[PDB]
Amino acid sequence: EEDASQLIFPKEFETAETLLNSEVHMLLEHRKQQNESAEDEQELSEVFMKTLNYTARFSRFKNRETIASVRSLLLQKKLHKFELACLANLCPETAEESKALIPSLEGRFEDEELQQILDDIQTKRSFQ
Amino acid sequence: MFYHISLEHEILLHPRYFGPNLLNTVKQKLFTEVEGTCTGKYGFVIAVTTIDNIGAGVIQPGRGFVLYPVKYKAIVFRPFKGEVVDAVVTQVNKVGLFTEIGPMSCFISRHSIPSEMEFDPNSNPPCYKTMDEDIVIQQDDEIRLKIVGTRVDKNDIFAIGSLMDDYLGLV
Amino acid sequence: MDDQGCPRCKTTKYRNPSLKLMVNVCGHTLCESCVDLLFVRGAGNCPECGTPLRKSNFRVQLFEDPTVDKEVEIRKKVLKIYNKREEDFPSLREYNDFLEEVEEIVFNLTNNVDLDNTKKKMEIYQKENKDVIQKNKLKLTREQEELEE
Amino acid sequence: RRRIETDERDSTNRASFKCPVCSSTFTDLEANQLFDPMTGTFRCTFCHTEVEEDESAMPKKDARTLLARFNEQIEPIYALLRETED
Amino acid sequence: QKRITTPYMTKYERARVLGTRALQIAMCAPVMVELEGETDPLLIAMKELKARKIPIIIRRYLPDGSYEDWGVDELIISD
Ligand SMILES: [Zn+2]
Ligand SMILES: [Zn+2]
Ligand SMILES: [Zn+2]
């Protein structure tokens, strides 16, 4: 019925737009500030905090421009939003790893194009 | 994968909240009701970005409560089988590893751990390490796992992980 | 189709040629009826040989000879080495000299352990990966395309 | 063959964890539900008692022995069939 | 706009509106009108109705499946 390795998803999640942990981190930090501002309002949930902690720890991009560049760059490529989300969220270092991690990635682009895209993403990444 | 989607939800506003600040109360109540909850259809919903629309408030006969159908843009997470995801190991046992993925919890069975790994219970933090000691998997670590399957129960979602594939485990 | 089949499920093979045998590093004939059991226990262990498989490692093949299956799999791997073209050698013996040991390695690897084979392959890889493998990769892929065309 | 294939598929789907009180076997998918961190071990919700797993090797091995011999003994009929397909 | 039903509140509408509004007040809903010494939620609902200040809209379903949302403040009360 559903299989990410086969890119099979329900219409509810196929028509939807994918978000990166760097993007979710920025949004959660924004929601945090939005919750920190106007004090004495409802406190944030443990799920939000757990997701924030998790998304921050695995956040591959720490700057607004790096997140926007990655998104705007990948949107130009003729790749599916799931493929692009997996690629930018997992950040595979090489084309072989990308094909290994995403068995559906094969055939969409040549090794040189695939590696060039990954190389750009690897250069745009923020390392701690 | 995380997603941004418009969701349908119905708020049963109690009459005490009618009158002024009605819609303001519905907004506040929506965030409180949906944020931090999970549904098998859309997964866990982390935060509400905006509310698309507030429908007509139908007064429930006899109940007095008014039912407000709401359309709102929110961010959600749902794990799909045959997917690789980053995880943090929470507990390490001889039968398997318990891990967390944001709001989701994943269990990795021993049979899904690579043959090169071996459990080192004598270590202070219980961990699995390679024969050549090149990598070690323990509690509170950076790992990647393949979702073999996803489960939903008690308004919660939990997946099955595997580390047999390459580029998995400690990262 | 003509062969009996897997040591366990030797019955559907007689029915139709649409079902194909699967080859593995262990050089053992396997198929879904048997493969499903290999995942419930061991998760990638040969039934009779017990040898573990790093992954599924299943590939479609239509050869009844398991030695050819292994030899082809080995051949395909070894062709990445020693495959420098004829212009590299001035003497007629050299054109087939390395092919002798290569064919010995390929053949011997079907039965003997790869300990010395991998060592020799690695000891030559350290030298051939620099230039000749880089050059022969281009020429091999080019001539392969010429063979396809 | 379809029944044997069904029995083989069953041998692959058989539950691994089990409860000694109610004699119920649970699939490894329930492992996260059966494992209680307060106890540090697997337990049964109905029996509030320990759930075992290591015995799961027995059904996997045993079933293969019965199912495999079926093809070994039917060989005369298969040969006679191959000889009579015309 | 484009309303065809009668502008008068039917006896049935008056009954349900008062019952529904009385129930909301009993459930401590805020009250629309200046009440004086009143405690019976049903008596308060009638005062709100006399003043035409009940905060309710009647969705009159037409036989063709269409409907007309008439505010209680728009209908002529039959009392
Ligand atoms: Zn073998
Ligand atoms: Zn077999
Ligand atoms: Zn029990």
From Swiss-Prot, chain C:
Subunit structure as annotated in this protein's UniProt entry: Associates primarily with CDK7 and cyclin H to form the CAK complex. CAK can further associate with the core-TFIIH to form the TFIIH basal transcription factor.
Parent sequence residues shown: 1 to 149 of 309
Name of protein: CDK-activating kinase assembly factor MAT1
Modified residues (N-acetylmethionine): 1
Function: Stabilizes the cyclin H-CDK7 complex to form a functional CDK-activating kinase (CAK) enzymatic complex. CAK activates the cyclin-associated kinases CDK1, CDK2, CDK4 and CDK6 by threonine phosphorylation. CAK complexed to the core-TFIIH basal transcription factor activates RNA polymerase II by serine phosphorylation of the repetitive C-terminal domain (CTD) of its large subunit (POLR2A), allowing its escape from the promoter and elongation of the transcripts. Involved in cell cycle control and in RNA transcription by RNA polymerase II.
Compartment list: Nucleus
Membrane-spanning segments: none
Chain positions found as Phosphothreonine: 51
Tissue and organ distribution: Highest levels in colon and testis. Moderate levels are present thymus, prostate, ovary, and small intestine. The lowest levels are found in spleen and leukocytes.
Zinc fingers typed RING-type, residue spans: 6-50
From Swiss-Prot, chain D:
Family: Belongs to the TFIIE alpha subunit family.
Summary of subunit composition and partner proteins: Tetramer of two alpha and two beta chains. Interacts with TAF6/TAFII80. Interacts with ATF7IP. Interacts with SND1. Part of TBP-based Pol II pre-initiation complex (PIC), in which Pol II core assembles with general transcription factors and other specific initiation factors including GTF2E1, GTF2E2, GTF2F1, GTF2F2, TCEA1, ERCC2, ERCC3, GTF2H2, GTF2H3, GTF2H4, GTF2H5, GTF2A1, GTF2A2, GTF2B and TBP; this large multi-subunit PIC complex mediates DNA unwinding and targets Pol II core to the transcription start site where the first phosphodiester bond forms.
Lineage of origin: Eukaryota, Metazoa, Chordata, Craniata, Vertebrata
Name this protein carries in UniProt: General transcription factor IIE subunit 1
Gene designation per UniProt: GTF2E1
Chain intervals annotated as zinc finger (C4-type): 19-47
Known role: Recruits TFIIH to the initiation complex and stimulates the RNA polymerase II C-terminal domain kinase and DNA-dependent ATPase activities of TFIIH. Both TFIIH and TFIIE are required for promoter clearance by RNA polymerase.
Compartment(s) of residence: Nucleus
Annotated positions binding Zn(2+): 19, 22, 44, 47
Species of origin: Homo sapiens (Human)
